[PDB]
Amino acid sequence: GSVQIVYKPVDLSKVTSKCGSLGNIHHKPGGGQVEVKSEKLDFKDRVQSKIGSLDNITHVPGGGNKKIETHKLTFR
Amino acid sequence: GSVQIVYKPVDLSKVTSKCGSLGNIHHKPGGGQVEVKSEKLDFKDRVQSKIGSLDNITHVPGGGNKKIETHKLTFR
Amino acid sequence: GSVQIVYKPVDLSKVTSKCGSLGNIHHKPGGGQVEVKSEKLDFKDRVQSKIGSLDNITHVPGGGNKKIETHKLTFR
Amino acid sequence: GSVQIVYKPVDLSKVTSKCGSLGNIHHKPGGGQVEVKSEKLDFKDRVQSKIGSLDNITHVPGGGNKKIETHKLTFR
Amino acid sequence: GSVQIVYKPVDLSKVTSKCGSLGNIHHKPGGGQVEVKSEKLDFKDRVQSKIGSLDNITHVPGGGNKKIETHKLTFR
Amino acid sequence: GSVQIVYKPVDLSKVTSKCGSLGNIHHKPGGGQVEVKSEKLDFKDRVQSKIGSLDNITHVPGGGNKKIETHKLTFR
């Protein structure tokens, strides 16, 4: 049939930050204990897994701004 | 059939940061203990796995800005 | 059939940072213990795996900005 | 003067234990944090001191029996 | 003067243990953090001191029995 | 003057242990962090000091029995 699809999303947006001095940041973890028991692990088809972790992060981006965009057009 | 698809997403967008001095950042973890028991590990078809981690990160990007974009067009 | 697909995504976008002095960053881990027991490892078809890790990262990029873009066009 | 002191304490005592199997003992501390601030420390004449400790003990003596005796005779 | 002192403490005592199997003992500390600030430390005349400790002990003596005896005779 | 002191402490005592198998002992510390700040250390006349320790001990003597005696006879 005479199908017509026009797809023109427009994006002039901005994601912006101003920051002064960024600093004097202390991260001082006091250890710890982690234990995991399992018999069978059986992972299929798009699995993301963490088992038995003791992980420390210090993340100090001067910006850290995010712009996430998705477009999908499906025709049948 | 007479199908017509026009696909012109427009993106003038910006992801921006200004930062002053970035610094005086201390990350000082106090160790720890991790234990994991398993018998069978059986992973198939797009598996991402961490088992038994004791991991430390200091991440200090002057920007660290992200712009993630996805486009899909499906015709049937 | 008389199918017509026009595909012209336009991207003038920018991902930008200004930073002053970047520095005086200290990362000082206090060791640790990790133990993992397993009998069978059986990995197939796009497996990403870490088993038994004691990992330290200091990542200090002056920018560290990311622009990630994906396009797919499927015609049947 | 005609002072006479006789000092003959008699000790036939016993401190005794019987034990079977001694074992299957688990000590698993989960870390912690300790902080102390002080300006002047000024210790004189028989001082015993612990400042800022995070100490773990597992003590499993098969016996661990104690006999402590003091004798004093003083004459002026 | 005609002072007479006789000092014959008698000790036939015993400190005794029997133990079977001694074992299957686990000591697994999860790290930790200790911090101490001081300006002036000024110690004199029989001082015993620990400052800022993160100490682990496993002590498994087959006996560990103690007999401690002190004798003093003083004449002024 | 006609002072007489007789000093004959008698010690037939014993400190004794029997133990079976001694073993299967695990000591597994997960690290840690210790920090100490001081300007002046000023120690005189019989000082015992530990400053900033991260110390691990496994002590497994088959006996580990102690007999301690002090004698003093003083005449002034």
Swiss-Prot record, chains A, B, C, D, E, F:
Subcellular compartments: Cytoplasm, Cytosol; Cell membrane; Cytoplasm, Cytoskeleton; Cell projection, Axon
Tissue specificity statement from the Swiss-Prot or TrEMBL entry: Expressed in neurons. Isoform PNS-tau is expressed in the peripheral nervous system while the others are expressed in the central nervous system.
Organism in which the protein naturally occurs: Homo sapiens
Name recorded for this polypeptide: Microtubule-associated protein tau
Spans of repeat Tau/MAP: 3-33, 34-65
Sites bearing N6,N6-dimethyllysine, chain numbering: 8
Cross-link annotation Glycyl lysine isopeptide (Lys-Gly) (interchain with G-Cter in ubiquitin), location: 8, 14, 18, 28, 40, 44, 50, 66, 72
Domain comment in the entry: The tau/MAP repeat binds to tubulin. Type I isoforms contain 3 repeats while type II isoforms contain 4 repeats.
Role: Promotes microtubule assembly and stability, and might be involved in the establishment and maintenance of neuronal polarity. The C-terminus binds axonal microtubules while the N-terminus binds neural plasma membrane components, suggesting that tau functions as a linker protein between both. Axonal polarity is predetermined by TAU/MAPT localization (in the neuronal cell) in the domain of the cell body defined by the centrosome. The short isoforms allow plasticity of the cytoskeleton whereas the longer isoforms may preferentially play a role in its stabilization.
Subunit and interaction comment: Interacts with MARK1, MARK2, MARK3 and MARK4. Interacts with PSMC2 through SQSTM1. Interacts with SQSTM1 when polyubiquitinated. Interacts with FKBP4. Binds to CSNK1D. Interacts with SGK1. Interacts with PIN1. Interacts with LRRK2. Interacts with LRP1, leading to endocytosis; this interaction is reduced in the presence of LRPAP1/RAP.
Glycosylation sites: 44, 50, 66
Site (Not glycated): 8, 14, 18, 28, 37, 40, 67, 72
Modified residues (N6-acetyllysine): 8, 14, 18, 28, 40, 44, 66
Disease named in the record: In Alzheimer disease, the neuronal cytoskeleton in the brain is progressively disrupted and replaced by tangles of paired helical filaments (PHF) and straight filaments, mainly composed of hyperphosphorylated forms of TAU (PHF-TAU or AD P-TAU). O-GlcNAcylation is greatly reduced in Alzheimer disease brain cerebral cortex leading to an increase in TAU/MAPT phosphorylations.
Modified residue annotations for Omega-N-methylarginine: 46
Modified residues (Phosphoserine): 2, 21, 49, 53
Encoding gene, per UniProt annotation: MAPT
UniProt modification remark: Phosphorylation at serine and threonine residues in S-P or T-P motifs by proline-directed protein kinases (PDPK1, CDK1, CDK5, GSK3, MAPK) (only 2-3 sites per protein in interphase, seven-fold increase in mitosis, and in the form associated with paired helical filaments (PHF-tau)), and at serine residues in K-X-G-S motifs by MAP/microtubule affinity-regulating kinase (MARK1, MARK2, MARK3 or MARK4), causing detachment from microtubules, and their disassembly. Phosphorylation decreases with age. Polyubiquitinated. Requires functional TRAF6 and may provoke SQSTM1-dependent degradation by the proteasome. PHF-tau can be modified by three different forms of polyubiquitination. 'Lys-48'-linked polyubiquitination is the major form, 'Lys-6'-linked and 'Lys-11'-linked polyubiquitination also occur.
